[PDB]
Scaffold this active site. Structure first.
Site, PDB file in Angstrom:
ATOM      1  N   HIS A  87      68.126 128.805  92.266  1.00 47.98           N
ATOM      2  CA  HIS A  87      68.555 129.103  93.631  1.00 47.98           C
ATOM      3  C   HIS A  87      68.549 130.618  93.852  1.00 47.98           C
ATOM      4  O   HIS A  87      69.467 131.173  94.447  1.00 47.98           O
ATOM      5  CB  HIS A  87      69.962 128.547  93.882  1.00 47.98           C
ATOM      6  CG  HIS A  87      70.056 127.057  93.769  1.00 47.98           C
ATOM      7  ND1 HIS A  87      70.089 126.226  94.869  1.00 47.98           N
ATOM      8  CD2 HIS A  87      70.138 126.246  92.686  1.00 47.98           C
ATOM      9  CE1 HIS A  87      70.186 124.970  94.470  1.00 47.98           C
ATOM     10  NE2 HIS A  87      70.217 124.954  93.150  1.00 47.98           N
TER      11      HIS A  87
ATOM     12  N   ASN B 177      74.172 120.415  97.482  1.00 43.71           N
ATOM     13  CA  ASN B 177      72.786 120.457  97.942  1.00 43.71           C
ATOM     14  C   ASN B 177      72.676 119.874  99.349  1.00 43.71           C
ATOM     15  O   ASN B 177      73.683 119.596 100.003  1.00 43.71           O
ATOM     16  CB  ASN B 177      71.892 119.642  97.007  1.00 43.71           C
ATOM     17  CG  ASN B 177      71.715 120.291  95.646  1.00 43.71           C
ATOM     18  OD1 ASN B 177      71.578 121.516  95.528  1.00 43.71           O
ATOM     19  ND2 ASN B 177      71.707 119.467  94.603  1.00 43.71           N
TER      20      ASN B 177
ATOM     21  N   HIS C  67      64.073 108.505  92.702  1.00 41.16           N
ATOM     22  CA  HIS C  67      64.896 108.546  93.897  1.00 41.16           C
ATOM     23  C   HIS C  67      64.785 109.904  94.590  1.00 41.16           C
ATOM     24  O   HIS C  67      64.250 110.006  95.694  1.00 41.16           O
ATOM     25  CB  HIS C  67      66.361 108.254  93.546  1.00 41.16           C
ATOM     26  CG  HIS C  67      67.164 107.732  94.699  1.00 41.16           C
ATOM     27  ND1 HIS C  67      68.326 107.009  94.533  1.00 41.16           N
ATOM     28  CD2 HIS C  67      66.972 107.830  96.038  1.00 41.16           C
ATOM     29  CE1 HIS C  67      68.815 106.686  95.717  1.00 41.16           C
ATOM     30  NE2 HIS C  67      68.013 107.172  96.647  1.00 41.16           N
TER      31      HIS C  67
ATOM     32  N   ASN D  14      71.871 118.673 106.437  1.00 41.23           N
ATOM     33  CA  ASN D  14      73.214 118.248 106.059  1.00 41.23           C
ATOM     34  C   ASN D  14      73.536 118.736 104.655  1.00 41.23           C
ATOM     35  O   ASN D  14      72.645 119.136 103.910  1.00 41.23           O
ATOM     36  CB  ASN D  14      73.337 116.722 106.105  1.00 41.23           C
ATOM     37  CG  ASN D  14      73.173 116.163 107.504  1.00 41.23           C
ATOM     38  OD1 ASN D  14      73.768 116.660 108.462  1.00 41.23           O
ATOM     39  ND2 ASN D  14      72.360 115.118 107.629  1.00 41.23           N
TER      40      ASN D  14
ATOM     41  N   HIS E  17      77.065 103.559 103.075  1.00 40.57           N
ATOM     42  CA  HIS E  17      77.977 103.800 104.193  1.00 40.57           C
ATOM     43  C   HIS E  17      78.622 102.517 104.712  1.00 40.57           C
ATOM     44  O   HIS E  17      79.624 102.564 105.438  1.00 40.57           O
ATOM     45  CB  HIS E  17      77.231 104.478 105.348  1.00 40.57           C
ATOM     46  CG  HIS E  17      76.831 105.893 105.066  1.00 40.57           C
ATOM     47  ND1 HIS E  17      75.585 106.231 104.581  1.00 40.57           N
ATOM     48  CD2 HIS E  17      77.514 107.057 105.189  1.00 40.57           C
ATOM     49  CE1 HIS E  17      75.519 107.541 104.416  1.00 40.57           C
ATOM     50  NE2 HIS E  17      76.677 108.065 104.778  1.00 40.57           N
TER      51      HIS E  17
ATOM     52  N   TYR F 212      78.293 127.393  85.110  1.00 38.92           N
ATOM     53  CA  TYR F 212      78.477 128.407  86.144  1.00 38.92           C
ATOM     54  C   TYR F 212      79.311 129.614  85.750  1.00 38.92           C
ATOM     55  O   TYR F 212      78.828 130.748  85.790  1.00 38.92           O
ATOM     56  CB  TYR F 212      79.052 127.774  87.410  1.00 38.92           C
ATOM     57  CG  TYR F 212      78.083 126.847  88.107  1.00 38.92           C
ATOM     58  CD1 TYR F 212      77.645 125.675  87.488  1.00 38.92           C
ATOM     59  CD2 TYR F 212      77.601 127.139  89.376  1.00 38.92           C
ATOM     60  CE1 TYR F 212      76.756 124.818  88.115  1.00 38.92           C
ATOM     61  CE2 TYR F 212      76.707 126.286  90.016  1.00 38.92           C
ATOM     62  CZ  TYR F 212      76.290 125.127  89.380  1.00 38.92           C
ATOM     63  OH  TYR F 212      75.433 124.267  90.021  1.00 38.92           O
TER      64      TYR F 212
END
Ligand code: HEM
Lengths: 500, 499, 499, 499
Positions: free
Chosen positions: B72, B145, B191, B210, B302, B355
Site C-alpha cells: 500500500h 480494504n 473469490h 465502500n 446480508h 504492523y
C-alpha cells in the site's frame, strides 16, 4: 532524609499530594487491565500473540538503547543561564552579548573522554565542558575542555589518537603499548600530556575545574571589524583536585561521583558558578606571534594577552529525565550566531563537520527537533523538509525552493560571514615540527614547582612503566628534549619499576 | 483561477497579507546572509568546509527519504470525524460509541497495494481504507480494504503472495508467470480474484468505493457479553468505477488522479461521507454457520446477518503537509480499545504483530510520538522509557518499574480482556481445502449478470493470457470448478490470444 | 516462446536439471516442516508466539524496504568491462589507462531524476549514466548524465531545484508553478532546459543515448603535469529518441520499458557499446577561455577542443538479483584514484560530499562492504574499524592507529594529490550572471534547425502553459533574451492554450 | 616477557616476518599519500572539502558505535567446540547429538547484567553464559545464566525488573530504593536473591562458574517421543568465587579482569572445560511434580531427577577482533533445530520474541549475515529477500514465493514440531503466589551451612540497609517467611547500620 539525590522517588511521590495514580495505558493510550500477567491458554499453556499489551511494552524495551558518544561517553548534565556583566560589544555584535544584565538560558554537560558508558568518573582524563546558548539568533554551542590545549594539532590524527586511548581491537583491554606508542611518536602531545599527568589531571568534581574554548575563534563587531579570541570560564568554586589515592578509591566506591556531586549541589541551593573571560588578539599581533596563533598545542600568555571579563555562568537546575535532557543533548561547534565565527585552526575546521555528521548517526537526521536541541528562543524557517521522525508540522505547506515568488523566508544580507584574504598552494602542509617543547619547558619550570614536578614525573612513570622498553626509550628522549631533569627523573623512576 | 490543488502556493501567499518574509535560518536557528552562493577561496577557487550553511542544508536533503510501506505504498490522506447516529451500546462498551451524537476525530488514508511510491492510482488493485480514531480510551485503528474478503486465509502465505504481485527478483518487472502460478496453486483466492477483476476492480476515486474491516472482530458489552461482528462503511457518494479504457488513459494522464480528486473535493466543501454498519453474529450462530466464521475468504450473507446502522464518517479537511500527516501516519490493527477485541481469525492474528513491528523499522521505535500518530485524545502513562528520537519528557522522573510504592500509574481491572475457552492440539492445521468455490459460484451467478460475467471473464483472460500455457491450464481448471461456463468462457478468450 | 526477460523463472528452473529442491530453512538455518500453515491451539484457536517460523519470515518481510535514492530513483543496471584502445598515458597516470588492451570490470546504472521508484521510464527527464571501474588503485566512479551541461552552476541551489521538480508539499502533486517559478528565476537554466525540451529529451532506451561526465576534471601524468578534461562516451548503437506520442503511450503501456529493453538486449548477445573520448584543455587555454572553464552551464566546443579516443565501454552481463546488484549499488564521484582529480567546479566540489554522505544514510555507514560496492580488485587496508553491520574481519587484530611501530599499513608518497596555487577572498562569489544566453543562442540556431526549433518551442509551451500567467511572462522574457524568435514563437503557442 | 594479552600488537608484528607494510588506502581502495596532514589553502589557510581522505576516515569514525545490549552489555567471548561423549539419542534426534565423537563448532560469550559497557567485571550480578552451536540442522543457541533459577517467573515483569536494577530516570545513579521496592513486592524473587547474595554471587572469572539453560525445554526423539529436560554444564576447572573485599579491589584495579583472565588462559593452552548434563522428566512425572515444572523460580532436585552426561564443552580459541566476533554475536533462544523445542514456561515463551526482535534493532534486520552469526554449517534457502545491508547474492534470481512450480526450496515434513493438547480459558492467569518460600527455606538450611548463612545475611544487610525503612520492613517480612532466623539475622544487622 538522606541526600536529595537518593530521595528522588520519595520527593516525586510527595509532589502527588491528594492526586490519585494515573491510569496505566499502552503505547497507543489504551488502558491496561493487568500488566503483571501474560496471556496464555490455560494456567500452564503457551503464550499467544494476542497479548499486544506484552509485546508493546517488550518491543519498546528492546529499543531503549542508542549508540553512545564515540568519545566523551560518560558525563553529567545541568541547566542555568548566562549573564552579561561587562560590555564587550566593541568586539562582537552577537546578540548574546547585546547589553549588560542580559540573561540567556544555557545547557551544560561535563564528561570524561575514553571511558565508556559504564566507566568511572574519578579517573585521570581530560574533562568535557560543553555549553549550549539558546540565543535569539539561533543556538550557540561552545564545546570546550578543562584544558586550554590538546595533544595533537591536526584532526586527521584524532581518529587514531582516540583509538590508541581506548581498548585493543583483539583483546578489548586498555593497552599501554598503544597509548605511549602514539604519544612517543607525536612529541607535540608533550604539552597536554604534561598537563594531564599533573595535579589538574583529576578534578574533584565538575564544579572545581576551569573551562576553555581551547581553539582560536574569531569575533566580528557591528562594523565588520574582526579580532581573534579564546574563551575561558573560571570556576567560582575554586580549583580542587583529588589525589591519586582518593580518585582510585572513589573510582570504585562511587563511579558516578561526579554525577551525584553536581546533582546534590544544585538540589541544595549551592548553584555552581563560572566567570566568563576572553583573550583578545588583533590581526596585527596575530602575525608577530612567535608561534602559530591557531596551533591548538599552544597557549596565549596572560601577560601579553590579559583576560577580559564578560559575564557569569550559573547552573541552577538539574535535569528531569537524564536520557531525554542529557544523553540526548547534542552540541555542534558549527552552531555560531552572527558575531562569532571560526578560524584557520585545523582542529577546529575538522570539528565543524565531525559533530553534526555524527549526531545524524547517534540520534538521527532530525536530531534538532529533540527539545533539548531545538532552538526554541529562535524561529527556524528555511527550505529543509522531511527526514525520519519528523516532528512539528514539517513547516507546513510553504514553498520549499529558494528563490520563489511566494513570500517564503529570505536570506538576511546582514548575517554575511566575515571575509579574509588567503593565498598559497592547496596541499597537506606538515605541521609535525611546529616546536613541541618551548611552551612545555616553560610549564615544567615556572608553572609548576618542586612538589608538582616530582608528583608529575611520578604520575607519568607509574603509567609509562607498563609499556615495552623500546617505547619507554622514545618517550624519555622526548621528555629530555623538554628539559634534562624532566627526562632523567622519569628514567630514574622507570629503572625502579623495570627492575622488579 | 484553477482547481484549488493547483493554487496551493498562490493561496499560501495570499494568507500572508501584509506579513513580511520570515528570516531564512539554518537548522540551529542561525540567520543566513546568502543561501544562493557557496563559499570558495577566490571566484574560481575550491569550496571549504567552513560553509556550514551549505552542509547543514545539503546533509538534511540527503536524508529526506524513508523506506516506503512494504505494501500500500501509493496513497492519499484526509481528516474528519466520526459521529454516532444509532445506539449500539448493548453490543460494545467502547467509549467511541458511548452516546448518540458523540463526535470523535478521525484520520484516513486510501491506497493501492503492489504499486510502488511512483506508481499510478487508477490501476486494477485492491484499495486501502484505513481509519484512525482518537478516542479517550486510546487510539483505535480500523485498517480495512474496499473488499469484504481476501485471496488467502493464512498469514504465513502473505509474504509470498505480495512477492508474486510485485516485480521479478532478477528482471525487476511484473511477472504474469508469478502472479498466476501462485493464484493457480491457491484456489482459495478465486473469490477475491473474481471480485478484483470485476467492475469494482478499479473504483473511480476513493470516494466512490465502500470500505470493510474484512476480519471478524469481537465485541464486548458493559456486562462482559461478547458477540462477533464485521464492519462496513458505505459511500454516500455512490459506487462508481472507471472503465478499462478510462483507467488506462488516466493511468498516464494523471497518475495521482485519486490524490487530486479527493483533495479538490474537500477543498471545495464537497466533503465525502460514509455510513457505518456492523454485522452481528452471536456465539451460537457462530457454530451453526456452514463455514468458518473467521475465514477471510468467506462473507456473511446480508440475509441471515443484516447490517446495523451505527454512525457516519466524514472527511472535511485535507492535510497541511503530506509527508508529515500522510506518509508518516501509521495504523496498527492491534490498537483496539476496551469493548473491541480480536478473533480466532488467523489472518488477523498475524496482523496483530506485523504492523507495529514494521512501523518500528519504517518510522522508528518511538513513531507513536509523531503527532499524527500520538494519541492526543488520551493520556499516555506507562513504564516505557528511552528509545531513539525520544520526544516529550520521556515521562519525566517517574518510577519506571511495576509494581512500586510511589504512586506511579496503575492497571485498571475494568480493562481486562474477554475470556474464551479453547481446546485441542497446538499444530499447523491445514486450511487449504476449506471450500473455495461454493460462495464464489453464488457470486458469479446471482451477484453478477450477463454483462458483468462477460466483462469479468474478459478482464481475466486479458491478463492470464500473458502467462505460460501450463499455468493457464491450472487456472482454467480452478475456474471450471466454480462454474462450467466460468471456465469455458475464459478458455475461449484465451485460445484467441494464444492463437 | 517469449522474450528472455519473461522466461526468467523458466530458465532458472531449467538450470536445475536432476538437482532436487533445496530444503526450506528458517533464517538461522533450521529446517521448516510446514510453511503453509500457522500454529494455533485447535483448528479455530488463536495464534501463539511459539511459531518462530512464522515470525522469522514475517519480521524480515516487514523490513525489506529501504529509503530510495533522493534523486534518480528509477533506474536499471548492467555489467560489462572497459577496454583501453588508445594510449593517453601522456595525460593521466591512472592504472586504468595503463596500457592498450587493458580490460577493467565495470558497473553501470541508468536512471531518470524526479521520478520515484514506481514512476515510468519513457518520460522527459535527464538520464543517469554512472560507471564503476574496479581498478587496482581503488574503485573509480564516473557519475554522468546524458547531457553535457546542467540547469544550475552552484550546488547550494540543487536541493531547492530538485524540490521544485518534485511533488508539492501539501498536495503531493507535480506543480508546474514551482517548476517554472524556479527556472524563471534562474536564467542560467535556459541552456539545459533548451536541451531537455529538445528531441534528446526522451531517449529510446538507455542504449540509444550518449553520456558525459559533464563536469570538468583534472588529469595528472607520471610527471606531475596536470591538464583539465571532460568525459564523453558515445553510443555505438546510435542516438534514438521516442516521440511525444510514443513515449506517452509507453509511459503506461510498459513503465519498465527502459529496464526490459536493456535486459533483453544483453540477454540476446546484443551487448550495447559506447566509445570513450576525452576533451583536453591545458592550464593556459583555461585562462584564454571566454567563459569559466568550470561552469557546468557551459560546453567545450569540439572545434577548439576535439575529442580524443581512449577506449570502449561494453555491457555484456545482466544482474542476477536487482536489489543486491542494482538497488544497492552506490557511486561516489569522490572515488577517484591517482591520475584523476577534481576541479574548482563548484557543482563538483559540493558533490564530493553529498554522495558518500547520503549513502551512509540510505544503505549504511559500512555500505562499501556490500559486494557490488566493495573494491575487490584492490586491497583495503587502513585504520578504520567497527560500525553497524561490520562484515569481513574488521581487519582483524591489527594496529588501529597511525603512526605506529608495528608494521600496520603505511601511506604511499606517490599517491599525493596535485597542488595548485590559489588566492583571493573567502566569500560567496555571486555567479548568477555568468552569461546565460550566448551559448544557448548558438544552440537554438546552429545546432538545431526549423523542425527541431518548432518541436522544441512546442514541447516547452505545452508545459509552461499550465503555469500562472505572471510566471509565464518571466520565462518568455528569458527566452526572448536568447533569441527574439525563441520567445515570440513560444508566446504565440501560449496565447493559444491560454485562450 | 609479559602476559600474551599485553603483547598482542607485539605478536602481530612478529607474524609479519619479511613482509612489507600494506598500502594505506581509503575506503574505496584508493591509496593515500599523506594521512598525517589535512589539506588547506596555504600553511595557515582553511580546510577544504576536497580532502575526501579526511572525510572518509572521519565520517566512518563517527559511526563506530552501535547500541549496546539492553542487558548483559559487559561481556567476553571465545570459541571452541562441543563433543558428544554419551549416547542420548533415545531422548532427542537433534543432529548435534547424532553419535559419540561428533564435534560441533561453538561460540560463547560471558557477561554481567545491569552494568553498562564500561562497567567492571568483578561485581555481584548474575552471569551470562550463551552458547551457539553451528549444526547441520541450523544454528542452536543455548542462552543461559550461571544460576539455575531466576527472580521472576513471568516475562511481563522483566522490563520493570531490569529497570529497577539499572539507574534512576532522573539522577542516573543506582537506586537501592528501586532495587528493593520491587524485590520486596515480588517475594518470588527470594530464591534467586538468596543465591545472588551467596558466595556464588561473584565468581572468580568465567571459567570457575557453572552454566544452566535454566528454562524447562522439550526433547523429541526420532519416534515423536517427547520428554522435558534442563541443561547443565559444570566447570571442569572447579567452582571458585572471589571475596567481597577482593572483588571490590579488582573492581577498580582491573575492571576487565574477566576478559583478560579468559583470554590469557586460552592463549597459554589452558583451554577451559565444561561437562554437559541433562535432567529428564517424563510427561507423567511432569504432573506429579509438587510444583509447576515450568516455574523458572524452581529447580529440579538431583535426587528425583539426576544429571545425565551428554558431552564436553571446550574453549580453545580467542577472538581476533572483539567487535566483529564478540560485540556483534547475537544469540536467539528461538534458534532450536529438530529434536529440541520450547515449553509452556512463560519466561521462555516471551524470550522467543524478545531476542530476534532486539537484534533487528541493535545490529540490523540482516544480522544473521554477519559471519559470527551466519549459520555456515547449514544451507540457508528460503523465500526471504532484500533488507538493509543485504550481503551475499540475496539468493540470486530464484522463485521468491511459496508454493511455486519452478524447483524453489521445499518444506521438509520431517521437521514438523511436536504437538501437545492444551485446554482452558485464554486469560492472564495470576502466578504471584506460586509458593515463594518452600524451595528457598530448603536452600537456606540444607544447602548452606553456618558460615554461608551468616555471610549471606551479611551481604544482604550490607546492601538492603541503604534503602528506606518502610522498604526495609517489607523485605524482612518476606525473609522471615522463608525462615525465622533468616529474617531476624537480617533485622539484627540492619538495626546496627540504621543506628
Ligand atoms: C551538485 C549537484 C548534484 C548533487 C548534490 C547530486 C546529488 C545526488 C545524490 C544525493 C544522489 C543519491 C545517491 C544515492 O543515494 O545512491 C545522486 C545520484 C545520482 N546523480 Fe546526482 N547530484 C548532483 C548532480 C548530478 C549531475 C550533474 C549528474 C551527472 C553528471 C548526476 C548524476 C547522478 C546519478 C547517475 C545518480 C545515481 C547514482 C547511484 O545510483 O548511486 N548528479 N545525486
Amino acid at each position: 532524609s538522606r541526600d536529595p539525590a537518593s530521595d528522588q522517588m520519595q520527593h516525586w511521590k510527595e509532589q502527588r499530594a491528594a492526586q490519585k495514580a494515573d491510569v496505566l495505558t499502552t503505547g497507543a493510550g489504551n488502558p491496561v487491565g493487568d500488566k503483571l500477567n501474560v496471556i496464555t491458554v490455560g494456567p500452564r499453556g503457551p503464550l499467544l500473540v494476542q497479548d499486544v499489551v506484552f509485546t508493546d511494552e517488550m518491543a519498546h524495551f528492546d529499543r531503549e538503547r542508542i549508540p553512545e558518544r564515540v568519545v566523551h561517553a560518560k558525563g553529567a548534565g545541568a541547566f542555568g543561564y548566562f549573564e552579561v556583566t561587562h560590555d564587550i560589544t566593541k568586539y562582537s555584535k552577537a546578540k548574546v552579548f547585546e547589553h549588560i544584565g542580559k540573561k540567556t538560558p544555557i545547557a551544560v554537560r561535563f564528561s570524561t573522554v575514553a571511558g565508556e558508558s559504564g566507566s568511572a568518573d574519578t579517573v585521570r582524563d581530560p574533562r568535557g565542558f560543553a555549553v549550549k546558548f539558546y540565543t535569539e539568533d539561533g543556538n550557540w554551542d561552545l564545546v570546550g575542555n578543562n584544558t586550554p590545549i590538546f595533544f595533537i594539532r591536526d584532526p586527521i590524527l584524532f581518529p587514531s589518537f582516540i583509538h590508541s586511548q581506548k581498548r585493543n581491537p583483539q583483546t578489548h583491554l586498555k593497552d599501554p603499548d598503544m597509548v605511549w606508542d602514539f604519544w612517543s611518536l607525536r612529541p607535540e602531545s608533550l604539552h597536554q600530556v604534561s598537563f594531564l599527568f599533573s595535579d589538574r589531571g583529576i578534578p574533584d568534581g565538575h564544579r572545581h575545574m576551569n573551562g576553555y574554548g581551547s581553539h582560536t575563534f574569531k569575533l566580528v563587531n557591528a562594523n565588520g571589524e574582526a579580532v581573534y579570541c579564546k574563551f575561558h570560564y573560571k570556576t567560582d568554586q575554586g580549583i580542587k583536585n583529588l589525589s591519586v589515592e582518593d580518585a582510585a578509591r572513589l573510582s570504585q566506591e562511587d563511579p558516578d561521583y561526579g554525577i551525584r556531586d553536581l546533582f546534590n549541589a544544585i538540589a541544595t541551593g549551592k548553584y555552581p558558578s563560572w566567570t566568563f573571560y576572553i583573550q583578545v588578539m588583533t590581526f596585527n599581533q596575530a602575525e608577530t606571534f612567535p608561534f602559530n596563533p591557531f596551533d591548538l598545542t599552544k597557549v596565549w600568555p596572560h601577560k601579553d594577552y590579559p583576560l577580559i571579563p564578560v559575564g557569569k555562568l550559573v547552573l541552577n537546575r538539574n535535569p528531569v529525565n537524564y536520557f531525554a535532557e542529557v544523553e540526548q543533548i547534542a552540541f555542534d561547534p558549527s552552531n555560531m550566531p552572527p558575531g562569532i565565527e571560526a578560524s584557520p585552526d585545523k582542529m577546529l575546521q575538522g570539528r565543524l563537520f565531525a559533530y553534526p555528521d555524527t549526531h545524524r548517526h547517534r540520534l538521527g537526521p532530525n536530531y534538532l527537533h529533540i527539545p533539548v536541541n531545538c532552538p526554541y528562543r529562535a524561529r527556524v524557517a528555511n527550505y529543509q523538509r522531511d527526514g525520519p521522525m519528523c516532528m512539528q508540522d514539517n513547516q507546513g505547506g510553504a514553498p520549499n525552493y529558494y528563490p520563489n515568488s511566494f513570500g517564503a523566508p529570505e536570506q538576511q544580507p546582514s548575517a554575511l560571514e566575515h571575509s579574509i584574504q588567503y593565498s598559497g598552494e592547496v596541499r597537506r602542509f606538515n605541521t609535525a615540527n611546529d616546536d613541541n617543547v618551548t611552551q612545555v619547558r616553560a610549564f615544567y619550570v615556572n608553572v609548576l614547582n618542586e612538589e608538582q614536578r616530582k608528583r608529575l614525573c611520578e604520575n607519568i612513570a607509574g603509567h609509562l612503566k607498563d609499556a615495552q622498553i623500546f617505547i619507554q626509550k622514545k618517550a624519555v628522549k622526548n621528555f629530555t628534549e623538554v628539559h634534562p631533569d624532566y627526562g632523567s627523573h622519569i628514567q630514574a623512576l622507570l629503572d625502579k619499576y623495570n627492575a622488579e
